[PDB]
Design a protein around this ligand. Structure first.
Ligand SMILES: CN(C)c1ncnc2c1ncn2[C@@H]1O[C@H](CO)[C@@H](N)[C@H]1O
Ligand SMILES: [Zn+2]
Length: 866
């Protein structure tokens, strides 16, 4: 499989302007007729090169003449000797029932549905399957009326009919030109939740959420969230929906999350279906996020699309930024920022230190489905956020507005977007552009000096990015470095120099620089990289007391949390080293006291307290180390929990009880109280065994919502409480028929600290609720084991690696996209000790040798073994 390169982009030799599709739908044999209107832009002698995969070609006509000047080649239909302008007619057959990869037209249960991003449309017909070819679609769908009463495509219905032999048809037209990755088709029998949204200018939009029969009870929150998304995009960004109908279809079989097909989004049901007994607060807020995200793409992705796939972050960085801003405005901004930074530092930085490292605008791709990454998405969004930091809201929105004025109805590049921001704001983003081309995490080192003679405070700030596997050369970035200086009372010291204010966002643009501040009347405590102002590792020699000072006094809630993270990091590192020498946890009294103070502080937001009382995950902890010792990290996390449980027992139980809520509401203040209560319950579970067992079992049985029930169940498994096996069986007996609810239970099984977790997981391959045909079940059992139980995955006997190789050997053939997601923990081998590296390398070597190795896995495996 051959790599493609960004620098190789060239405008297409032919465009398509209009495509009329007819589907004669059948799960075993679907016939596609595609009539395209084409224009040659390149040389007269250049053939038309159409992409296609696993298609049975029936016929090729050019202006209704059966064509003889063509050939099929791997992946392609090459058509020669064409006029400058012509009508192409292709007829071909495809087989949805055989499509286990879930790419193209496939079956989800009894429904037929599509996934076309990135390159799935070529699995449906021969086409210019590249996102700089925009065309107007018309789609006619013919099917059995009893099996497929609903026949959906993008846009509005223009024609409908009934045929003999129980077939019917519907034809759709979408006026907006689109690249083919935004094509969608759905056929099936559904319950339908119908609502309306009226835009601020008065356009009434019909909203339609399509769910499997008997799931309407789980649909209102998704609808609520759609309307919220629409309203917010109007309020914040000034953008209105542009069509008459907005359709969402929830399907159970889906490799991604959800997909922004124009006017006909297709969602994994995990990101739609919720009711209070089936879904947690986090589920509710994730549905809100993903509903938002796909809606937001209607502008950032659909009305302006991507010139080529290397520009994916153009839509994904900006749409994730928008989803974050949406959640943050509606909810707790600080809890959002905290959890997005946890993702960045715990998951994204690992990718940027791995063999799959890439810039947010990649330069080299083998399989584009491998580049829907933490980097492109979440780091992408941090890059957008940095532009927002540099410009301010008002200039940022002027940039947005210039971007749409210039590029609406076209396919654009990341550079176009930056230029629009630069030109609208008059802020120079030339250096800033290097964030798009350079991979890896910058390390920002900060030293400080306070001169009492002159009342000056000096920060000496250096940067460097280490080389990564993909790039041997690195250069300094334009790093927006936000600070705040605090006096001995906790009050912010005004920043100034030579009699003038200085902006608190420092422009860290060199390898080394100094910043001098005047009229600093007291030695300050600095808050550095405020709100995570750039996606970098910060090196500052913090005292413990500077960090507890910030926890008490810092103005922004994020800074209070971040200071707690910096204080814990020192002691996580200390205790991992101790664990490797067989020595028990050591924690200063003053550290425990800082967490006690947070528990008893009446003035702190409970949302913030809960996050400070949520220890860094085993992933966030791994980021603190060059070489990862996953057993030490897991055991240190447990011991730290037990230590705090003991030291803070009385305070934890008081706050647990104080935050009891008898009514359940999906409302942010309520959520905050509940997160705090369950944060306390986690520590209590790791306390004295009898009290723990009582508290946890009672919460599980008495809960009136899934948040509380699952928090108890997860604590029983994490602390290996007596009640665990009863409660787990209880859950299975109640919920086994409900795959989305059972996913939570598979995750708890896979992430268990029990010694026999792998045996349990293997046995669960045969569980009544598990199936290898469903990506959500696969992720929830196998994925969670490999990725979220690094202590068991990395068992010294190598059993974890062997288990993953077995599963990958199936999935490589069945569903390469899911396989490539699941191989990630093995490609991290260079972070582990030699003995583990040797076992992981052997596992990788085994997979490299598979018959019919997918491109998706080939790419990762070859990088890993280099
Ligand atoms: C370790 N890997 C592959 C991932 N770990 C966690 N989240 C991921 C990962 N790969 C992609 N994502 C998320 O998928 C979403 C897009 O499908 C992005 N939001 C990205 O974070
Ligand atoms: Zn997206």
């Amino acid at each position: 499989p051959q790599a493609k390169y960004r620098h190789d982009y060239r405008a297409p030799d032919y465009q398509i302007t209009d495509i009329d599709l007819t589907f004669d739908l059948d799960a075993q044999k679907t016939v596609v007729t595609a009539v395209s209107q084409a224009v040659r832009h390149g040389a007269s002698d250049a053939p038309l090169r159409l992409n296609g995969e696993d298609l049975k070609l029936v016929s090729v006509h050019i202006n209704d003449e059966p064509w003889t000047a063509w050939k099929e080649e791997e992946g392609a239909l090459v058509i020669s000797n064409l006029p400058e302008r012509f009508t192409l007619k292709i007829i071909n057959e495809i087989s949805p029932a055989a499509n286990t990869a879930l790419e193209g037209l496939y079956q989800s249960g009894d429904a037929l549905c599509t996934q076309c991003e990135a390159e799935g449309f070529r699995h449906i017909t021969y086409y210019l399957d590249r996102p700089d070819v925009l065309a107007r679609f018309t789609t006619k769908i013919i099917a059995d009326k009893i099996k497929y009463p609903f026949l959906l495509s993008n846009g509005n219905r223009v024609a409908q009919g009934e045929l003999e032999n129980g077939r019917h048809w519907v034809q759709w037209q979408d006026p907006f030109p689109k690249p083919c990755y935004l094509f969608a088709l759905v056929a099936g029998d559904f319950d339908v939740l119908r609502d309306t949204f009226t835009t601020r200018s008065g356009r009434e939009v019909a909203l339609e959420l399509y769910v499997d029969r008997g799931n309407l009870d789980r649909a209102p929150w998704a609808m609520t969230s759609l309307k919220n998304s629409m309203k917010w995009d109007e309020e914040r960004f000034g953008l209105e929906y542009d069509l008459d109908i907005y359709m969402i279809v929830a399907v159970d079989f889906f490799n991604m999350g959800a997909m922004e097909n124009k006017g006909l989004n297709i969602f994994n049901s995990k990101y739609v279906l919720a009711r209070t007994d089936t879904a947690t607060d986090k589920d509710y807020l994730d549905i809100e996020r993903v509903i938002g995200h796909e809606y937001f793409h209607n502008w950032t992705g659909n009305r302006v699309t991507c010139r080529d796939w290397f520009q994916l972050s153009l839509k994904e960085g900006l749409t994730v930024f928008r989803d974050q801003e949406f959640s943050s405005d509606l909810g707790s901004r600080a809890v959002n920022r905290i959890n997005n930074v946890r993702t960045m530092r715990g998951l994204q930085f690992a990718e940027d230190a791995s063999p799959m490292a890439h810039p947010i605008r990649p330069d080299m791709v083998i399989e584009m489905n491998n580049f829907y990454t933490l980097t492109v998405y979440e780091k992408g969004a941090e890059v957008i956020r940095m532009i927002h930091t540099l410009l301010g809201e008002e200039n940022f929105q002027k940039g947005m507005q210039l971007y749409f004025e210039r590029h609406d109805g076209s396919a654009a590049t990341c550079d176009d977007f930056v230029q629009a921001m630069e030109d609208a704001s008059n802020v120079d983003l030339s250096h800033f552009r290097r964030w798009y081309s350079q991979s890896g995490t910058p390390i920002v080192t900060v030293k400080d000096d306070y001169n009492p003679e002159t009342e000056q405070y000096t920060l000496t700030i250096s940067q460097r990015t280490p080389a990564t596997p993909d790039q041997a050369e690195k250069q300094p970035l334009h790093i927006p470095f936000a600070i705040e200086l605090y006096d001995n009372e906790g009050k912010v010291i005004p920043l100034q120099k030579g009699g003038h204010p200085v902006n608190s966002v420092l422009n860290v643009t060199q390898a080394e620089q100094t910043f001098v501040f005047d009229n600093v009347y007291f030695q300050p405590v600095p808050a550095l990289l405020c709100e995570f102002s750039a996606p970098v590792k910060l090196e500052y020699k913090w005292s413990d007391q500077q960090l507890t000072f910030l926890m008490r006094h810092a103005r922004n809630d994020f800074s209070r949390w971040d200071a707690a993270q910096s204080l814990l990091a020192t002691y996580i590192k200390l205790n991992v080293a101790r664990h490797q020498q067989g020595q028990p946890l050591s924690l200063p009294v003053h550290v425990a006291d800082a967490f006690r103070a947070v528990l008893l502080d009446e003035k702190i937001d409970p949302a913030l307290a809960a996050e400070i009382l949520t220890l860094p995950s085993v992933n966030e902890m791994a980021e603190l180390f060059d070489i990862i010792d996953p057993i030490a990290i897991a055991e240190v996390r447990e011991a730290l929990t037990r230590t705090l449980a003991t030291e803070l027992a009385d305070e934890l139980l008081a706050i647990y009880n104080a935050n009891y809520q008898s009514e359940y509401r999906v409302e942010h203040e309520d959520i905050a109280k509940r997160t705090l209560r369950n944060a306390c319950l986690r520590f209590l579970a790791f306390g004295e065994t009898h009290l723990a067992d009582v508290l946890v079992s009672k919460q599980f049985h008495e809960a009136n919502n899934m948040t509380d029930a699952l928090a108890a169940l997860s604590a029983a498994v994490a602390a290996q409480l007596p009640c665990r096996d009863a409660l787990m069986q209880e859950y299975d007996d109640k919920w086994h028929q409900n795959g989305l609810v059972m996913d939570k239970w598979f995750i708890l099984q896979a992430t268990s600290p029990a010694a026999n977790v792998l045996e349990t997981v293997r046995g669960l391959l045969q569980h009544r609720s598990f199936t290898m045909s469903n990506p959500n079940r696969i992720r929830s059992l196998i994925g969670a084991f490999a990725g979220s139980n690094p202590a068991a995955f990395h068992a010294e006997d190598g059993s974890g690696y062997l288990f993953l190789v077995e599963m990958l050997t199936d999935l490589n053939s069945r569903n390469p996209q899911v396989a490539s997601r699941l191989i990630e923990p093995l490609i991290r081998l260079k972070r582990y000790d030699a003995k583990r590296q040797e076992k992981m390398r052997a596992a990788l070597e085994q997979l490299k040798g598979l018959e019919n190795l997918s491109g998706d896995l080939y790419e990762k495996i070859t990088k890993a073994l280099a």
